[PDB]
Amino acid sequence: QSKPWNRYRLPTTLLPDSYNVTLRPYLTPNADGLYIFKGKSIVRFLCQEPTDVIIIHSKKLNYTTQGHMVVLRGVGDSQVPEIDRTELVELTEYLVVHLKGSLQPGHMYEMESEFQGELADDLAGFYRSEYMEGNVKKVLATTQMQSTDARKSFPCFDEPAMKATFNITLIHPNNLTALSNMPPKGSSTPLAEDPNWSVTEFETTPVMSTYLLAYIVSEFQSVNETAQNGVLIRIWARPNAIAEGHGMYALNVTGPILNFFANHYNTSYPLPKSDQIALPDFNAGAMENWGLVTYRENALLFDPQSSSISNKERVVTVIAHELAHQWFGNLVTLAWWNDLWLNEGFASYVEYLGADHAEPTWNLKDLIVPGDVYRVMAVDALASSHPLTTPAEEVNTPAQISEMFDSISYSKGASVIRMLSNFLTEDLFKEGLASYLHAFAYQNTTYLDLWEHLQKAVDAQTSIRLPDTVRAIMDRWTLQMGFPVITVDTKTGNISQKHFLLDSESNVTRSSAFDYLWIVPISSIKNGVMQDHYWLRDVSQAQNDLFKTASDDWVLLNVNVTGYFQVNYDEDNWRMIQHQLQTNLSVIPVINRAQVIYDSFNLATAHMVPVTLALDNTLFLNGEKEYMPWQAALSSLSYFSLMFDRSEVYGPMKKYLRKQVEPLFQHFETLTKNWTERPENLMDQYSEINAISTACSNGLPQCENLAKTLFDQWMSDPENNPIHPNLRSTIYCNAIAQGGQDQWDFAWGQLQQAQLVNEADKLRSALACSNEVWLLNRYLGYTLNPDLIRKQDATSTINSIASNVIGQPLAWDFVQSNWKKLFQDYGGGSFSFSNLIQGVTRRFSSEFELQQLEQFKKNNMDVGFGSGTRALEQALEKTKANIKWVKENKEVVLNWFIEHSS
Numbered sequence: 001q002s003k004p005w006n007r008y009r010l011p012t013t014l015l016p017d018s019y020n021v022t023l024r025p026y027l028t029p030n031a032d033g034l035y036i037f038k039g040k041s042i043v044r045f046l047c048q049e050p051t052d053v054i055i056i057h058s059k060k061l062n063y064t065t066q067g068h069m070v071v072l073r074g075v076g077d078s079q080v081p082e083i084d085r086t087e088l089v090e091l092t093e094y095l096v097v098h099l100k101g102s103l104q105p106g107h108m109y110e111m112e113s114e115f116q117g118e119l120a121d122d123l124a125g126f127y128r129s130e131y132m133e134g135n136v137k138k139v140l141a142t143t144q145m146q147s148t149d150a151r152k153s154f155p156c157f158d159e160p161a162m163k164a165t166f167n168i169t170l171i172h173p174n175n176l177t178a179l180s181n182m183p184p185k186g187s188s189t190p191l192a193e194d195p196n197w198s199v200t201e202f203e204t205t206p207v208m209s210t211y212l213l214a215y216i217v218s219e220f221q222s223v224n225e226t227a228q229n230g231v232l233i234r235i236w237a238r239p240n241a242i243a244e245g246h247g248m249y250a251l252n253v254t255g256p257i258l259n260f261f262a263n264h265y266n267t268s269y270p271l272p273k274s275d276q277i278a279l280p281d282f283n284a285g286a287m288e289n290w291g292l293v294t295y296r297e298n299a300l301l302f303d304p305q306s307s308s309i310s311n312k313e314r315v316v317t318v319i320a321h322e323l324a325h326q327w328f329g330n331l332v333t334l335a336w337w338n339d340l341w342l343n344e345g346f347a348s349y350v351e352y353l354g355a356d357h358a359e360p361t362w363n364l365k366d367l368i369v370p371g372d373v374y375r376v377m378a379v380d381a382l383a384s385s386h387p388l389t390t391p392a393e394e395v396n397t398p399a400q401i402s403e404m405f406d407s408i409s410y411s412k413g414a415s416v417i418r419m420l421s422n423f424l425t426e427d428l429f430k431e432g433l434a435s436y437l438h439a440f441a442y443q444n445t446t447y448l449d450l451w452e453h454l455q456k457a458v459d460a461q462t463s464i465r466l467p468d469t470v471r472a473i474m475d476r477w478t479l480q481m482g483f484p485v486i487t488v489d490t491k492t493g494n495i496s497q498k499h500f501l502l503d504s505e506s507n508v509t510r511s512s513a514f515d516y517l518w519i520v521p522i523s524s525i526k527n528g529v530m531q532d533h534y535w536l537r538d539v540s541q542a543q544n545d546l547f548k549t550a551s552d553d554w555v556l557l558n559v560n561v562t563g564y565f566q567v568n569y570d571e572d573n574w575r576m577i578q579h580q581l582q583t584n585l586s587v588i589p590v591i592n593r594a595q596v597i598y599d600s601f602n603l604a605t606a607h608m609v610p611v612t613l614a615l616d617n618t619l620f621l622n623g624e625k626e627y628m629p630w631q632a633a634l635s636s637l638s639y640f641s642l643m644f645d646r647s648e649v650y651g652p653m654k655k656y657l658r659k660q661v662e663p664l665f666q667h668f669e670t671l672t673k674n675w676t677e678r679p680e681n682l683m684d685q686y687s688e689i690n691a692i693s694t695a696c697s698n699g700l701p702q703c704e705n706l707a708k709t710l711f712d713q714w715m716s717d718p719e720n721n722p723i724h725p726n727l728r729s730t731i732y733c734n735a736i737a738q739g740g741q742d743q744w745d746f747a748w749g750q751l752q753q754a755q756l757v758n759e760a761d762k763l764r765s766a767l768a769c770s771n772e773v774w775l776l777n778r779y780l781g782y783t784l785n786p787d788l789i790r791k792q793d794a795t796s797t798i799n800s801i802a803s804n805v806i807g808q809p810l811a812w813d814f815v816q817s818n819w820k821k822l823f824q825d826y827g828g829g830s831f832s833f834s835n836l837i838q839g840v841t842r843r844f845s846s847e848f849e850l851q852q853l854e855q856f857k858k859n860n861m862d863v864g865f866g867s868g869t870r871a872l873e874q875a876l877e878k879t880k881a882n883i884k885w886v887k888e889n890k891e892v893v894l895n896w897f898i899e900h901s902s
């Protein structure tokens, strides 16, 4: 038999009841420059099955406990066995307490320890974060337990189902504020041994998972609101950020969001208070710690004076996402990491619902389609994809756990759950969801538990009828990878499904229990009129008159793309759809106007329609005012720009896009009153942003003029920037492009003195738009100077230069030549050679450029490629694919653009 301390999963012989944890960060280094934290903990646990060994998680902790690493006591009048020895097993991250006798079933024990670890700047466990206020480097102490890092802060049974209550105490400098999951018990008191420190105890948590604990010591201040029901709401940030009002939007939306979810979940917010904190350079983005959610600054803070509308959208949705978890994930927790998709998928879906409550005019629910659905289909339409579900017994190590957090989990998770809610109807979905939350509150679940509760709700009504059980249906979408293309022959109404792969030559080797057949919910509209709903059963082919048309009619499947699939038609039907969009576009829902474009380009890639059919699907856009369909086109064509923008194809492409976008440009010119005032709602602001971007980058003289006027204006009065934050990135870029070193030097100055990251980002990126070789090269010369360009921004800046058709050869030469600086930057901070390689080689699409990539690889003898080693092979393989796609497409595409550019 194997020794349990060499297994990655904990025994089930002992379960925790409750913990006391006292942590003390030392925010002053020890002289060799080491930061530490000290801790003391007691865990009370119950013996379920007799055992002579206590196995608990511990990671990078030194123990200073008197005697062995722990002291062990009986609770009440329980006797305790003597300890034989305590040992640390690093691989499985265990503290192992060998006893001289056995613990007894039904008895409770208390295990006490004293310990310390590094308070490292490593964003893991209890860690430090350094940042600037004026001339002073500030250091705060914060946490990130997700997923398996609670054990790095104190010894604990560190699996999500082993829930317990926690009594947290922080010992901290007396002028700093201490925060945790729960409110403080009362006022802090001086530490007797050194009154320069204070002691803050927090109220007992509810029964909860280790990965959701948080505790923070900082100088941060807050804005506050007390909801009607007494729930205290705070936004925490740097003193200067709070003073500038940058927390106000977050504060504005939080209350409405929490209220939405309490109703949505039919369950009261389970905590006395809600803290949200903006952390500078929090690389994890956001973390849903129960009652103390952490965010990176740019995710939580908003500056009205400098920030675009998309910045506002990012804030409200990120908040909605993390707050969703305060019920789904935190109150009811998935028993194991193999089910992470359900948790993350669920939040990734309802983030739109919660945000929609806060901003009900913005139509935010739509954004899941571009943002998650089409995003994840790009990777789920590969042979190298994977099922949402993973057997629990395959997910053991901290590395395997981390692999759970990917695109499939979040975005497909969101997509399939949204499909589910839609085919059940939302009211039914909510009833099952409430039932599930009430049944399992403060406990753990698998996805089968959710299915079971949804089934209960289905079985309790008569109106919604399904072709099979909730499980059986969802099994098709969760146990196998990928998704079907549904193809309709409208002459007969024959309808088929096959596993959709972008690469029509690809070999799938992952087998499916279902032979890649799905049970598919199919909505459809015929001549602008909703039809009866239809289910494709697990068959390759079927027939229904729902999908059979006359010659003047059209049909269109998957209304609003609720279903996780793409749709192809016979050419006649495609043409009727096209005719419709050409003559009265408003007959077809805006999301579907986008879909037509998204799907057909994917179908063209897969060789299932000709590419010209996809391009025909953009012809209607000259009368399209709305954001989404235009965004579908821009996303689908960016590859065409990337392949062709150095070729004869490019002039007719530009000309075609100029023709298409001119009327939209004109529309907004009037609507915005000569560009003085933005459109009202989000979608229209977005459409305007894209229209100006598209107009300018394609050389519409009117947009070019606008950019010069505004940038000249700004330059004549630097302190009063006349350019609305929504339009900044285009106007900066186009105007630098048009100009010389005057514009360039001016924007360089602004960059150097910018206080706000986002504005710095815009400037950095616009500077790459110059059409002077000498400026781009000089600029390249700065990117490795950490005085002029932050290191974490160097490869980004190089990529932006590479993106400039003129800066392509300059960047490539620069990367080649200074590659001999992996050995400055695999050592001194990561660097992401991987993203740099992809960026600078993205364009490569000929034999000659392939020969160059090869010849550059012949610098294998030493230096190698570091974290970009795999990227470089991807590059050579992507280039081969580009070579092949350009030979197949260049002629057909050139002539289509010539033909349609007037």
Ligand SMILES: *[C@@H]1O[C@H](CO)[C@@H](O[C@@H]2O[C@H](CO)[C@@H](O[C@@H]3O[C@H](CO)[C@@H](O)[C@H](O)[C@H]3NC(C)=O)[C@H](O)[C@H]2NC(C)=O)[C@H](O)[C@H]1NC(C)=O
Pocket (backbone or CB within 6 Å): 020, 042, 044, 110, 167
């Ligand atoms: C986990 O932390 C809890 C909070 O520190 C502990 O509970 C507290 O124990 C204290 C003493 O052990 C009690 O404080 C006072 O101490 C005096 C000492 O002279 C005692 O007489 C008193 O009982 C007590 N105060 C009063 C008003 O009587 C606290 O009563 C108590 N706090 C609580 C219960 O909220 C837990 O003991 C500790 N857990 C373990 C396993 O050690």
Ligand SMILES: *[C@@H]1O[C@H](CO)[C@@H](O[C@@H]2O[C@H](CO)[C@@H](O[C@@H]3O[C@H](CO)[C@@H](O)[C@H](O)[C@H]3NC(C)=O)[C@H](O)[C@H]2NC(C)=O)[C@H](O)[C@H]1NC(C)=O
Pocket (backbone or CB within 6 Å): 032, 036, 037, 062, 116, 117, 118
């Ligand atoms: C947890 O305990 C670890 C093992 O006891 C500590 O790791 C040791 O850190 C020492 C530095 O504190 C290093 O030893 C020497 O330190 C002296 C002065 O600090 C220096 O003169 C030497 O350069 C250094 N010796 C060497 C060979 O570098 C040890 O490197 C290191 N030992 C091991 C086995 O890793 C941790 O510091 C300690 N952590 C905490 C938070 O308490």
Ligand SMILES: *[C@@H]1O[C@H](CO)[C@@H](O[C@@H]2O[C@H](CO)[C@@H](O[C@@H]3O[C@H](CO)[C@@H](O)[C@H](O)[C@H]3NC(C)=O)[C@H](O)[C@H]2NC(C)=O)[C@H](O)[C@H]1NC(C)=O
Pocket (backbone or CB within 6 Å): 248, 249, 252, 302, 304
């Ligand atoms: C958090 O919510 C607050 C309350 O809803 C918002 O406060 C609103 O700020 C608006 C922008 O500053 C103000 O709108 C207009 O500002 C112009 C500029 O001077 C004035 O001419 C207008 O008179 C004024 N509004 C009106 C209706 O005349 C609002 O005054 C103000 N609304 C309220 C109710 O106080 C915050 O904007 C919001 N914070 C963020 C970051 O979104």
Ligand SMILES: *[C@@H]1O[C@H](CO)[C@@H](O[C@@H]2O[C@H](CO)[C@@H](O)[C@H](O)[C@H]2NC(C)=O)[C@H](O)[C@H]1NC(C)=O
Pocket (backbone or CB within 6 Å): 018, 019, 020, 042, 043, 044, 165, 166, 167, 204
């Ligand atoms: C954490 O604090 C809580 C709340 O004070 C402690 O809960 C008490 O537990 C004791 C001993 O089990 C019971 O007698 C009390 O009735 C509990 N009080 C409440 C309000 O539940 C809990 O024991 C503490 N945890 C640890 C490990 O000491």
Ligand SMILES: *[C@@H]1O[C@H](CO)[C@@H](O[C@@H]2O[C@H](CO)[C@@H](O)[C@H](O)[C@H]2NC(C)=O)[C@H](O)[C@H]1NC(C)=O
Pocket (backbone or CB within 6 Å): 028, 136, 175, 176, 219
């Ligand atoms: C908390 O107290 C510490 C110690 O007095 C203050 O930290 C000093 O701040 C000054 C600037 O005012 C620096 O020049 C010192 O080097 C700091 N010392 C240390 C160890 O950081 C700190 O400013 C106080 N913070 C608050 C919010 O009151």
Ligand SMILES: *[C@@H]1O[C@H](CO)[C@@H](O[C@@H]2O[C@H](CO)[C@@H](O)[C@H](O)[C@H]2NC(C)=O)[C@H](O)[C@H]1NC(C)=O
Pocket (backbone or CB within 6 Å): 262, 263, 265, 266, 267, 268
């Ligand atoms: C959970 O939902 C139930 C059902 O809507 C709520 O209870 C209903 O509340 C309405 C509101 O006036 C009453 O008229 C109904 O008679 C109630 N139905 C039942 C079965 O009691 C309940 O308020 C919700 N709970 C939470 C915490 O949101």
Ligand SMILES: *[C@@H]1O[C@H](CO)[C@@H](O[C@@H]2O[C@H](CO)[C@@H](O)[C@H](O)[C@H]2NC(C)=O)[C@H](O)[C@H]1NC(C)=O
Pocket (backbone or CB within 6 Å): 015, 161, 162, 163, 335, 440, 443, 444, 445
């Ligand atoms: C994981 O969650 C399950 C429920 O999904 C917990 O099992 C329940 O425990 C409660 C309260 O102690 C009992 O009332 C139920 O009868 C149990 N349901 C079961 C066993 O199916 C289980 O305790 C949780 N696991 C851990 C380690 O806490």
Ligand SMILES: *[C@@H]1O[C@H](CO)[C@@H](O[C@@H]2O[C@H](CO)[C@@H](O)[C@H](O)[C@H]2NC(C)=O)[C@H](O)[C@H]1NC(C)=O
Pocket (backbone or CB within 6 Å): 489, 492, 494, 543
């Ligand atoms: C639509 O589907 C039907 C089958 O369900 C196809 O009709 C069959 O054609 C085969 C040709 O070998 C005949 O042997 C069968 O007897 C036909 N079944 C009938 C007529 O009911 C038809 O070809 C399909 N048409 C499409 C996909 O355009």
Ligand SMILES: *[C@@H]1O[C@H](CO)[C@@H](O[C@@H]2O[C@H](CO)[C@@H](O)[C@H](O)[C@H]2NC(C)=O)[C@H](O)[C@H]1NC(C)=O
Pocket (backbone or CB within 6 Å): 363, 366, 530, 559, 560, 589, 590, 591
């Ligand atoms: C398709 O999505 C659109 C939104 O893009 C839905 O239109 C919404 O309809 C509801 C009910 O009338 C209204 O609350 C919203 O005002 C509508 N928004 C807009 C922008 O029109 C439409 O309901 C969806 N269609 C289907 C069949 O689900």
Ligand SMILES: *[C@@H]1O[C@H](CO)[C@@H](O)[C@H](O)[C@H]1NC(C)=O
Pocket (backbone or CB within 6 Å): 505, 506, 507
């Ligand atoms: C897939 O197997 C086929 C055999 O039909 C082979 O021709 C092809 O090269 C293989 N690999 C790819 C990526 O197409």
Ligand SMILES: *[C@@H]1O[C@H](CO)[C@@H](O)[C@H](O)[C@H]1NC(C)=O
Pocket (backbone or CB within 6 Å): 528, 584, 586, 587
């Ligand atoms: C276009 O269709 C919409 C929705 O069916 C309708 O209300 C509108 O009258 C139509 N417009 C024209 C110009 O026919």
Ligand SMILES: [Zn+2]
Pocket (backbone or CB within 6 Å): 288, 321, 322, 325, 343, 344, 347, 348
């Ligand atoms: Zn999440």
